[PDB]
Amino acid sequence: MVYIALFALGAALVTLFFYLILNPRVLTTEGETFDLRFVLFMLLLILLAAGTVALMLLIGKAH
Amino acid sequence: AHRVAITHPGGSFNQEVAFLFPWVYFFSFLIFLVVAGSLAYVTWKFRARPEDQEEPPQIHGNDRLEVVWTLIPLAIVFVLFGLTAKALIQVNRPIPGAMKVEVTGYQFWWDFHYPELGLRNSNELVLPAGVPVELEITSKDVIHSFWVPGLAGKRDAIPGQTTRISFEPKEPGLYYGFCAELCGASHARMLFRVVVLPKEEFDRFVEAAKASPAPVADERGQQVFQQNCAACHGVARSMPPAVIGPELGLWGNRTSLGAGIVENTPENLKAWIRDPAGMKPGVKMPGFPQLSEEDLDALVRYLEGLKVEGFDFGALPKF
Amino acid sequence: WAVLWDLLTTVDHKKIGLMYTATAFFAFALAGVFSLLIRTQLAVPNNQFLTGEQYNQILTLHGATMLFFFIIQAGLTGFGNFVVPLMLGARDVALPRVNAFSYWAFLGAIVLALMSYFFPGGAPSVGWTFYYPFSAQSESGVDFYLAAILLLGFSSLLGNANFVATIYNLRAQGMSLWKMPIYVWSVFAASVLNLFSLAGLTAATLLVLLERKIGLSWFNPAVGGDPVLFQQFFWFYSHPTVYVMLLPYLGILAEVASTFARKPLFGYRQMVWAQMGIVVLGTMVWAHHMFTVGESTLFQIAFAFFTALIAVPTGVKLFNIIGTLWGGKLQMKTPLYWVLGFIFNFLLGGITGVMLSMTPLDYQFHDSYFVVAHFHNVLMAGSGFGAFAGLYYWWPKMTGRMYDERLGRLHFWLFLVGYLLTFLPQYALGYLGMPRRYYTYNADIAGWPELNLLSTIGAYILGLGGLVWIYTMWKSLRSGPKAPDNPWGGYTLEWLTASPPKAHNFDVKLPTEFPSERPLYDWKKKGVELKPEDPAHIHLPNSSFWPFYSAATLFAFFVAVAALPVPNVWMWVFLALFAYGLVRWALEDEYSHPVEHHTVTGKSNAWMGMAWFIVSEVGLFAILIAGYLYLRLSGAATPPEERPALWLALLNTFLLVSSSFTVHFAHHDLRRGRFNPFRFGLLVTIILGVLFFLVQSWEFYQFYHHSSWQENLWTAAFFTIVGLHGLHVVIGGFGLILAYLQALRGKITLHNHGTLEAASMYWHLVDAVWLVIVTIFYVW
Numbered sequence A: 001m002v003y004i005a006l007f008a009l010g011a012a013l014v015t016l017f018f019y020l021i022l023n024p025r026v027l028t029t030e031g032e033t034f035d036l037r038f039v040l041f042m043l044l045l046i047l048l049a050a051g052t053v054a055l056m057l058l059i060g061k062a063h
Numbered sequence B: 001a002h003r004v005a006i007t008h009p010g011g012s013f014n015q016e017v018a019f020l021f022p023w024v025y026f027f028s029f030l031i032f033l034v035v036a037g038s039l040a041y042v043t044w045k046f047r048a049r050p051e052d053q054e055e056p057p058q059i060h061g062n063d064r065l066e067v068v069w070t071l072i073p074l075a076i077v078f079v080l081f082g083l084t085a086k087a088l089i090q091v092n093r094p095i096p097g098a099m100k101v102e103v104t105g106y107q108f109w110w111d112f113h114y115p116e117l118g119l120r121n122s123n124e125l126v127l128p129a130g131v132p133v134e135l136e137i138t139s140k141d142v143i144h145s146f147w148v149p150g151l152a153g154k155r156d157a158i159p160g161q162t163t164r165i166s167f168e169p170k171e172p173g174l175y176y177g178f179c180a181e182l183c184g185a186s187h188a189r190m191l192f193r194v195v196v197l198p199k200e201e202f203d204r205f206v207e208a209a210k211a212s213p214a215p216v217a218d219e220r221g222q223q224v225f226q227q228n229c230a231a232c233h234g235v236a237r238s239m240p241p242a243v244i245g246p247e248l249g250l251w252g253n254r255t256s257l258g259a260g261i262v263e264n265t266p267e268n269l270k271a272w273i274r275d276p277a278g279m280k281p282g283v284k285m286p287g288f289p290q291l292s293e294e295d296l297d298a299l300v301r302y303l304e305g306l307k308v309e310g311f312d313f314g315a316l317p318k319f
Numbered sequence C: 001w002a003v004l005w006d007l008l009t010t011v012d013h014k015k016i017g018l019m020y021t022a023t024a025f026f027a028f029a030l031a032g033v034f035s036l037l038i039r040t041q042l043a044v045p046n047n048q049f050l051t052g053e054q055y056n057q058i059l060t061l062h063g064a065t066m067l068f069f070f071i072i073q074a075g076l077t078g079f080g081n082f083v084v085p086l087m088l089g090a091r092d093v094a095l096p097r098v099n100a101f102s103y104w105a106f107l108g109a110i111v112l113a114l115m116s117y118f119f120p121g122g123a124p125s126v127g128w129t130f131y132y133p134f135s136a137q138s139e140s141g142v143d144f145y146l147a148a149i150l151l152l153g154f155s156s157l158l159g160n161a162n163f164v165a166t167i168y169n170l171r172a173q174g175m176s177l178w179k180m181p182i183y184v185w186s187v188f189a190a191s192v193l194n195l196f197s198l199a200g201l202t203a204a205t206l207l208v209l210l211e212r213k214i215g216l217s218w219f220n221p222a223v224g225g226d227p228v229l230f231q232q233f234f235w236f237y238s239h240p241t242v243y244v245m246l247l248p249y250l251g252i253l254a255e256v257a258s259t260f261a262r263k264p265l266f267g268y269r270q271m272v273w274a275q276m277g278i279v280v281l282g283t284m285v286w287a288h289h290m291f292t293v294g295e296s297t298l299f300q301i302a303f304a305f306f307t308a309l310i311a312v313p314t315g316v317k318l319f320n321i322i323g324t325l326w327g328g329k330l331q332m333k334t335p336l337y338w339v340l341g342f343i344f345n346f347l348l349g350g351i352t353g354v355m356l357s358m359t360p361l362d363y364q365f366h367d368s369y370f371v372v373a374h375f376h377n378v379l380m381a382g383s384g385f386g387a388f389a390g391l392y393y394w395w396p397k398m399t400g401r402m403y404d405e406r407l408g409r410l411h412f413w414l415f416l417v418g419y420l421l422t423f424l425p426q427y428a429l430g431y432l433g434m435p436r437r438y439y440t441y442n443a444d445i446a447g448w449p450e451l452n453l454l455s456t457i458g459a460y461i462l463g464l465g466g467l468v469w470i471y472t473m474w475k476s477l478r479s480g481p482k483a484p485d486n487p488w489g490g491y492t493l494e495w496l497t498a499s500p501p502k503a504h505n506f507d508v509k510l511p512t513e514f515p516s517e518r519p520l521y522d523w524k525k526k527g528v529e530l531k532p533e534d535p536a537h538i539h540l541p542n543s544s545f546w547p548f549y550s551a552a553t554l555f556a557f558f559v560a561v562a563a564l565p566v567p568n569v570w571m572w573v574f575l576a577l578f579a580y581g582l583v584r585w586a587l588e589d590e591y592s593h594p595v596e597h598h599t600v601t602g603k604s605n606a607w608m609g610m611a612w613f614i615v616s617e618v619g620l621f622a623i624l625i626a627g628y629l630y631l632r633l634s635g636a637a638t639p640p641e642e643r644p645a646l647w648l649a650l651l652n653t654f655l656l657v658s659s660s661f662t663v664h665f666a667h668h669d670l671r672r673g674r675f676n677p678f679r680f681g682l683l684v685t686i687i688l689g690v691l692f693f694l695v696q697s698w699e700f701y702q703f704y705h706h707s708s709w710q711e712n713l714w715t716a717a718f719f720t721i722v723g724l725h726g727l728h729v730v731i732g733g734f735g736l737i738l739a740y741l742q743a744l745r746g747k748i749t750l751h752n753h754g755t756l757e758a759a760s761m762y763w764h765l766v767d768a769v770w771l772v773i774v775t776i777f778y779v780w
């Protein structure tokens, strides 16, 4: 049950970080530095998403 | 006619999951009554007379109602899930001391090995009623799926690994089996039979199988077999060093032919030997159209003689 | 000829929308005929009408054509391209040339898939799911099927990014997201889900293709690969795809309900929340397609749980649609009939779906006609009915002609009755243990012959319905009564235009006050008089040949990949022609005159389109890395001794990170009007990228000579993920080069520099992904 909750938590974080960086209000932010901010979130999203999915695949082999 | 049904209580699997169905039927009946009933009411009640031009009351919702029609479905899925998990845990529980049977899938047929008995047979799997069995399943080529609906759910046969399913056959009979993973042109022709016998009778079949070699009912036939068939087919009723084709040592006991697609009869066997592909598109056995009629008949007599006496699987109830 | 040249060059979202719509519905008719061949073969046991490989080919074409070329197009790219900008009160989409390119790539994908017919092995015969290793071994036209999927992927992603950019940037002033029509929300939701999840299919497809063409495998058990990993990838998209297929139609159902009940939407906010709920859960359930493959019980239980949850957000959505009808004054026009048919039938479809989520029962139901009935229940009598609700609803708006209500209703009842007769018996067949994907069955299994015969009779009734449908459209176009602006009395902006709309959509200036999601209702009550638009403020995007040319050359690239051993000279010829096309495209003005670009967010359409497309890049690398992490952590993939050196990756990191700084400051200078410093920084960025590429190339050459990706799983993973990244460097590099060519022709100004914003952002992304790669492939 702990691992399933961990998977859920992963999905929630992926969801949350997508929201934080892609909602209409945040995208109106101005500055050459926002491009870097946006891209670093994507970097973090790759890690979160990969780890979340990897977790479940490994659970698949944990008989 | 075979009475194939996933609800048939022929094995411990179908008996153990049976309790889920009434719950599904109950909730579905209520959900339909309410939701479909409401929609039916709406279409009858709120149809508009063509002359009517007065807009109806512009209501935008009902916040309390939104909660009720979120929580009620939620409660229902929690119940269904709770039942589901309980059932899943039970049918996946390993049964200590169950007879192991190694199942192997090929395009497009099934091989069986009873490791404790040292016995090999193909396409028809004989089993004792009232005794727990553990199927250990794999494939030598592409993904297949081993499905005997009258007894249990399916489990895939995946190259490079071993999957398993455990259950206890209860009701003696002849069960239809199917491959349930599209594996190529003869997917629909990759069938089998599970022969469930009373324990006492099963112990006899296996004993006779290992007791003495397969008889030679026609010697001209044995030679023709050696010149044309032995290369791909064993008759020793045990695992050969390399498997190419199905085991034929218990052929005369087989109720069906071509991985369970046609009745085992001399006429069907001849047609098969002359042109397997005519019955199984993409099949990996050549036809033998050159053989003289005299050789083919002699060969069929020999093949039908490869058996043990005193069994009639075709007389079992058909499932 | 004149009409052809117009279509080949158009960027009008309405014409693009009509082309998608017509193509999608043609696909439905083609695949419907395929289904008639299937059901004829199945009408009786032991039939010899369509057998073996030939049957499996028709089956595969039936499913893939319906899923990829019809259902996920009609209500999304079809109606959506036509209607969404109108609903938003806009004059076009955010990226008109990209939008056209997406249509032609779509057509290209269809041609790739069907042309397999003319090559050795003919059409793919491995099912739409192309399971490994079966699909790796087949002689059938698998390569064409895979190429088609990949080409189609470009259409979808670009199209999705275009939709979201259009929604964010082009909403009529005063219209917040929460005043948009529910259908726009549903197109929004579908597009976002699609952008992120397509990765699974892209990965599964790319990996099988690489294996067939160059022997690189992640799935081969002989090197410790996992055949089941293929299914994990595939279904990671292939569940979400059905929700991508559902959302827009639920949106349509809600729109139709409101219009024909003369009521506002019941629980609008809840409808949006429900679609959001479906998007999230839609990516957490894929493995319910894999219950019988021997994964752990805990894994299976996890997916049964999240899958059953999906029922909640979906129910809420349906209940709100019913609430919209409740208390209304129902106009029994054709579109409403489809809506009612959808809802009544979807109940059973969703219920059986939940039955399948009950793992123990699925052990029985899996790969049987019970599943087949379930998915036709929700795809045919569900989405399909939704598609026809949409077709009849917007027909007057799209064609300028009214259809005969009598024929529309006859079409409906034939589809309803036909549907029930075709598929209800199939549920029963599943209970009777009939496996799916069987070209034939025996005569000694009780119930099968009778139920199969009934099913086939049903299918022929659908056939009739089909004839009635075609006649109805034909009659409407030839002798139909001319359509008014707002035939049904709708309240959303698409009804404020002519039928069909003038090229620029709105002849009037729109008010900037939106009290609700029914502007036509609120404005009429306020007696708001709408003033004509000044033609001086009306600017339409220019026509262009380059989107079609680009799609054509890419199509040809994929033919060379599908039909020949890789690599080959033709791949390069067409890639070169393709690059040339993109250069001309980049140097071609969007408009003839100067134009004021103002968006709702302040960000350019180029920027906004790129930011949403990048979501798909995150997805692709995420799923591939998940696979790699799984294979390595499970002990299957272990690096060889000759793995590429860390110091070389650090040198490359220096190059790439530096390039992100040169490009950033290059942009900064552009913002200051210093053009020579800008040209210089851009060029420096490009040179740095080239150096990164040359270094990688040498490293790849060396590593390839010390380790075979056929004998070592890690090596296969490395070449796959690091190789794919390399391809991105090339693409991003080319993007920067387009901006540079623009700068050399004076096309880059303080005013216009969209290409630069997009390319720059995409470059930074390539930089970020490298950092993850260094971490997991060189450090670890």
Ligand SMILES: CCCCCCCCCCCCCCCCCCCNC(=O)[C@@H](CO[C@H]1O[C@H](CO)[C@@H](O)[C@H](O)[C@H]1NC(C)=O)OP(=O)(O)OC[C@@H](COC(=O)CCCCCCCCCCCCCC(C)C)OC(=O)CCCCCCCCCCCCCC(C)C
Pocket: C095, C096, C097, C098, C101, C150, C153, C154, C161, C202, C575, C576, C579, C582, C583, C585, C586, C587, C588, C589, C590, C591, C604, C605, C606, C607, C609, C610, C613, C727, C730, C731, C732, C734, C735, C736, C738, C742, C747, C752, C753, C754, C755, C756, C758, C759
């Ligand atoms: C093995 C080989 C592999 C090859 C196969 C892969 C092939 C990849 C195919 C990719 C297809 C992409 C479709 C192309 C769409 C973009 C067309 C770009 C040209 N058009 C433009 O730049 C402008 C010119 O207009 C502009 O300038 C004018 C001034 O003159 C102004 O008047 C206009 O107003 C101004 N326009 C705007 C909007 O401001 O046209 P538009 O107006 O239409 O704007 C359009 C743009 C502007 O910005 C851009 O276009 C930047 C994109 C640069 C990327 C090009 C890569 C091409 C590959 C080269 C092959 C190598 C040959 C190398 C040598 C041989 C030479 O918007 C976007 O970013 C929308 C988002 C686009 C998404 C990126 C795609 C990335 C693909 C990743 C694939 C991963 C594989 C993932 C898996 C699926 C694998």
Ligand code: HAS
Pocket: B023, B024, B027, B028, B031, B035, B072, B073, B074, B076, B077, B080, C129, C242, C243, C245, C246, C288, C289, C307, C308, C310, C311, C312, C314, C315, C316, C318, C346, C347, C349, C350, C351, C352, C353, C354, C355, C356, C357, C358, C362, C365, C366, C367, C371, C374, C375, C378, C379, C382, C383
């Ligand atoms: C548009 C197309 C589709 C939609 C929508 C869809 C929705 C669902 N599906 Fe599905 N699907 C499955 C489960 C679900 C569930 C749980 C939902 C849900 O999203 C549907 C929810 C909708 C409702 C639920 C109705 C409204 C909600 C109400 C009214 C609330 C009350 C109901 C409750 C509380 C539930 C009670 C349920 C009871 C049974 C009592 C499963 C099982 O886990 C399989 C595996 C089959 C196999 O083993 O191969 C599957 C397979 C498929 C395939 C086969 C792919 C192939 O080629 O092999 C296709 C095309 C498809 C399409 C679609 N599917 N689906």
Ligand code: HAS
Pocket: C028, C029, C030, C031, C032, C033, C035, C036, C038, C039, C059, C060, C062, C063, C064, C066, C067, C070, C071, C127, C128, C129, C372, C376, C379, C380, C384, C422, C436, C437, C438, C439, C455, C459, C462, C463, C464, C465, C466, C467, C470
């Ligand atoms: C949205 C996606 C889908 C739609 C819609 C759909 C509709 C139908 N289907 Fe289906 N399906 C089957 C039967 C039907 C029938 C009878 C209809 C009907 O609803 C179709 C109605 C539509 C028509 C009957 C078309 C009428 C149109 C006419 C009459 C126009 C004629 C004029 C023309 C064409 C002019 C054009 C020509 C010119 C020259 C312009 C069967 C068999 O009973 C199987 C399993 C086979 C097996 O062995 O498992 C099956 C399996 C599948 C699978 C699994 C594929 C796989 O296993 O790989 C998928 C994804 C799928 C999707 C879809 N299916 N279906």
Ligand code: HEC
Pocket: B107, B108, B109, B122, B123, B225, B228, B229, B230, B231, B232, B233, B244, B245, B246, B254, B256, B257, B258, B259, B260, B269, B272, B273, B280, B283, B284, B285, B286, B288, B299
């Ligand atoms: C290798 C090239 C073979 C030769 C030589 C022979 N057979 Fe065969 N046979 C072969 C295979 C791979 C299979 C399984 C095929 C399938 O996909 O179903 C078979 C099967 C049979 C059967 C059916 C057995 C069953 O359990 O249903 C029969 C009756 C049979 N083969 C007979 C047979 C005879 C008489 C042969 C000599 C003429 C012979 N086979 C040679 C492969 C090969």
Ligand code: CUA
Pocket: B105, B106, B107, B108, B143, B144, B145, B179, B180, B181, B182, B183, B184, B186, B187, B188, B190
């Ligand atoms: Cu073996 Cu299908």
Ligand SMILES: [Cl-]
Pocket: A063, B092, C295, C296, C297, C298
């Ligand atoms: Cl387990």
Ligand SMILES: [Cl-]
Pocket: A032, A035, C663, C664, C667, C760
């Ligand atoms: Cl920048």
Ligand SMILES: [Cu+2]
Pocket: C238, C239, C240, C285, C286, C288, C289
């Ligand atoms: Cu699914």
Ligand SMILES: [Mg+2]
Pocket: B145, B180, B181, B182, C367
């Ligand atoms: Mg399967």
